[PDB]
Amino acid sequence: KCTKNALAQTGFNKDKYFNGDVWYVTDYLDLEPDDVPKRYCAALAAGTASGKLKEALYHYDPKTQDTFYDVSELQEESPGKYTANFKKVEKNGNVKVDVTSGNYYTFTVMYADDSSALIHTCLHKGNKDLGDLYAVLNRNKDTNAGDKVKGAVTAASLKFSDFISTKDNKCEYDNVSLKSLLTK
Numbered sequence: 001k002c003t004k005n006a007l008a009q010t011g012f013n014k015d016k017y018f019n020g021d022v023w024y025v026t027d028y029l030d031l032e033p034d035d036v037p038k039r040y041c042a043a044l045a046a047g048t049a050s051g052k053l054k055e056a057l058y059h060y061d062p063k064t065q066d067t068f069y070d071v072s073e074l075q076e077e078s079p080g081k082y083t084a085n086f087k088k089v090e091k092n093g094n095v096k097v098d099v100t101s102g103n104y105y106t107f108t109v110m111y112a113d114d115s116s117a118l119i120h121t122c123l124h125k126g127n128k129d130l131g132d133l134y135a136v137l138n139r140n141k142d143t144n145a146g147d148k149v150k151g152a153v154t155a156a157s158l159k160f161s162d163f164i165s166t167k168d169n170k171c172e173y174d175n176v177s178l179k180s181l182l183t184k
């Protein structure tokens, strides 16, 4: 199951966060880890297009070189708290899996900077919690978590030592497609 108490950042700035730029996941904490291990890479670009909040996701498996994209229209449940109804797409926006009722993830921006963030995400595929995931984002894929985001982790009653770093995961990102998917 998932957490639903994750508290949004007080005085969270949307304009800065949803600037249409790319966020890299430098570290994460998966409360519900799979039986089969898989060192992953992920990035996202959150922005505005056509008058709506949009988010584009990217997942990469270095080992298999497998890549998958997603694009969702966001609905604000409260500033910092969002619900995303995703659609799996080709890197050019061609839909592989349409939006579906049982399909959506929700996330909370627990802390945000000009250069870093801490989010809580809860993914549901086929209406069923798939577990809690906590991520440390950064606008730069090479920066280690700063004192501020780590304070935020602590403030949420978590342990950063429990976070896994995607640093030497041999990641590769497609920021061009990530940003362009924003309009799809």
Ligand code: HEM
Residues within 6 Å of the ligand: 025, 028, 030, 038, 040, 041, 042, 043, 044, 057, 059, 069, 070, 086, 087, 088, 097, 105, 107, 121, 123, 125, 130, 133, 135
């Ligand atoms: C930045 C936050 C992230 C968001 C918002 C997010 C969102 C999602 C979404 C929407 C899917 C479904 C794609 C589809 O089938 O169309 C997915 C699948 C997946 N993600 Fe993430 N994800 C994030 C971070 C990560 C990280 C860091 C890992 C590494 C632990 C991870 C591992 C996976 C795996 C293994 C799948 C497929 C599992 C399944 O289909 O149940 N994700 N993610």
